[PDB]
Design a protein around this ligand. Structure first.
Ligand code: TDR
Ligand code: TDR
Lengths: 446, 446
């Protein structure tokens, strides 16, 4: 079947055969599938869905569209990874990859760019001058040899079909598809040759699933399809009454990740890194319990070894050694200097007295997207200095006129609608001040 | 709003504002809308639909995406056109444009290429060496001055937004959309500045919507939106289960068109040319009744004047004068020599005794599409010599082993599936032989 008939089948709510799916994926890889045919297929899938068998075949076809990664036998047990479905201000991966390398693991992370109103690890890393996200299978061997970790993107050799579709999904309103997400995440992790995978599936607005049960179905699908494809997968269901940490953006999130690797940073960020890291170390058999693993990851954050591994990864992936060292050993203020900065800053002030009940992630994601932190079309460059910093904690009592959000923007102003959208993100109440709740994190186990 | 937001709105079954539609159309024209975004919007519209107001605004936006055609005042009443929704083997337009010119009309026809499994007039004309379908607004003045007619394609000056979307729709299973068809047809006809339009909508196997109710609704929509936009439109709903005439393809359909302008050819082809031409002459006030108009058109087919006008149109649009003359004044055998020929021919024979009840148009269209008469991707060149000739009439009694279909192919030989698909197109029965019924033709008015 040529492309037009395959689209028509799915458009009508028909099931696509193994041959059909593999044919479409082949056409995507070789360029036969034109843009409009990719967008129409994606939308057909988004509106008409796929059953488990279709989803499973799509995952295999995307994985097999490039090369499978092979590693020394001695590494087989050390190979672990973590993936997120997406979360606003989630920079766990920047910290967790080098922290796990410091715990004697190997992390061959194939990651992703932005997707809808959620930022991607690859875009965050590109705020570091010279960082190269495109790395060959053999170069990835060297990186894992040098730093014990790497964070790379899809390319012509690695899951090229996911790269194409992901880039198109971002900008065509086809991100929030269960079969597409499953195939996208799992294809990348399948080619990595892992002993264990943890996938962090978050819910609550901002997220791909504003609802716990919805997200639960995705978590169970990821684990079920994962297992049927030979991979040891666990999911973590996570929720928050705020963005993760204080920084949303790209350069800003690198900065906060560096804070965490200093043994500092916000507690929620550290809690999630240690929780997910420890889950992984337990899952791969490197820790007796999740709690033992979490303490092991925490220790790596505290003794400079995670930071050390991160510096090695940066230099190994194209960052100038002098800059990588200057960035990692530098103070917060020196780091700000080395990374892209937005030309302008403004602070939003608290309209009244109140306890911060919540900082809504979604309105913040949407406004930052429009300011250059997201894409309206594929391949569009980002403004990596753009972002926002939360200046208050959830549960904190604050006075009126106290700054709660600093926005970093390249233009002269927030538009009225975006100024208003950001103001409505701040939820205040009469309640007594309380400790910032640590992220919800329930495991879905193999 | 930006495109992913526009696509998302339509994806969710939401209504797009006038501003939204115009923004999307603008983005298509200037290149801002990438292929994938065009495909996703088209599939969203295909699956979720548009209301009459949306459809009307989309028609206006496509019309206004290029130049409006202006003509001498003296031509205002002479300006007429006919458009089809599609029909396998429908070459009425190749004949009717010059025939109407011969009846003292002006026909500034903006037409189209192939669309799904149905061939387009512009691809048929391109089997004539040197024929240029791209003609500027001022060049069109010259053509109408020289031949009284022209057949041109969408370009950067003429309905560019339709050209883009039409080319995508062809290959993304988004052809059979009521709002997309209405907006596509009417936008082209609106810019021509016509005094009267006839749109030929078919139902039955040969049609875009074989279901009669779908076709009637499309006819009423075209007329209703047309009228509301200032255009005098009529529709002809014609049932047709078999291809029109005997030839399906491109070079082959030019050849059969030339037979009709010879005063010859098959009765169904001539009947439809005279029926639709006379409807038009009546509608524009050039004939007292449809029957008086049809006799007028028939006379132009009989005295060589339609053929004369067609030769002028060919030469004016780039065809070498010596070739145009040699083609028009030439015998059927000489014409075959001048136009592309497939390398190979094979005939399918009658499996038994029987009266031909029917030759199913759809299986024929689908097989010829696969042999190079159609596109699996936009901008793909066609094999213009490929096609098929019906060697029998419907209603004709035939013996077993008598050739009923001649297939002109460039590749190796018909496969098992396509050979079988063509054989099932021939419907035979025990009935007494009967006269080939002439096209059903019901006229829809505002
Ligand atoms: C939602 C999502 C997150 N991460 C991925 O790699 N793919 C996806 O589709
Ligand atoms: C079906 C169809 C026929 N002709 C056109 O110009 N557009 C269409 O969408």
């Amino acid at each position: 079947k040529q492309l037009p008939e395959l689209i028509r089948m799915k458009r009508d709510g028909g099931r696509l055969s193994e041959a059909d799916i593999r044919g479409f994926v082949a056409a995507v890889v070789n360029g036969s599938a034109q843009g409009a045919q990719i967008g129409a297929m994606l939308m057909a899938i988004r509106l008409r869905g796929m059953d488990l068998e279709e989803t499973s075949v799509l995952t295999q076809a995307l994985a097999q569209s490039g090369q499978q990664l092979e590693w020394p036998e001695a590494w087989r047990q050390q190979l672990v990874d973590k993936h997120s479905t997406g979360g606003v201000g989630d920079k766990v991966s920047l910290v967790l990859a080098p922290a796990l390398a410091a715990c004697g693991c190997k992390v061959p992370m194939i990651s992703g760019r932005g997707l809808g109103h959620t930022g991607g690890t690859l875009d965050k890393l590109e705020s570091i001058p010279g960082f190269n996200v495109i790395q060959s299978p053999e170069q990835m061997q060297v990186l894992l040899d040098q730093a014990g970790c790497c964070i790379v993107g899809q390319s012509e050799q690695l899951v090229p079909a996911d790269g194409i579709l992901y880039a198109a999904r971002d900008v065509t309103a086809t991100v929030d598809s269960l079969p597409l997400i499953t195939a996208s995440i799992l294809s990348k992790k399948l080619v990595e040759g892992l002993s264990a995978l943890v996938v962090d599936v978050k819910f609550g607005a901002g997220a791909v699933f504003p609802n716990q049960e919805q997200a639960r179905e995705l978590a169970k699908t990821l684990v079920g399809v994962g297992a049927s494809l030979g991979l040891r997968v666990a999911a973590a269901l996570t929720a928050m009454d705020k963005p993760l940490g204080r920084c949303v953006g790209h350069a800003l999130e690198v900065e906060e990740a560096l804070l965490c690797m200093d043994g500092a940073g916000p507690p929620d960020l550290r809690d999630l890194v240690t929780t997910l890291g420890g889950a992984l170390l337990w899952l791969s058999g490197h820790a007796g319990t999740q709690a033992q693993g979490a303490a092991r990851v925490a220790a790596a954050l505290d003794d400079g070894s995670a930071l050390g591994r991160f510096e090695r990864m940066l230099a190994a992936q194209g960052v100038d050694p002098g800059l990588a060292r200057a960035l990692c050993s530098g103070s917060p203020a020196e780091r700000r200097q080395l990374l892209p900065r937005a030309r302008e800053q403004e602070e939003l002030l608290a309209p009244a007295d109140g306890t911060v009940e919540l900082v809504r992630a979604l309105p913040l994601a949407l406004v930052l997207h429009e300011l250059g932190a997201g894409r309206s079309r594929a391949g569009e460059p980002l403004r990596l200095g753009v972002g926002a910093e939360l200046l208050v904690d959830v549960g904190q009592r604050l006075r009126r006129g106290t700054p709660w959000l600093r926005v970093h923007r390249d233009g002269p102003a927030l538009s009225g609608p975006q100024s208003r959208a950001l103001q409505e993100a701040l939820v205040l109440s009469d309640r007594a001040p309380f400790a910032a709740p640590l992220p919800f994190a329930e495991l879905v186990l193999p």
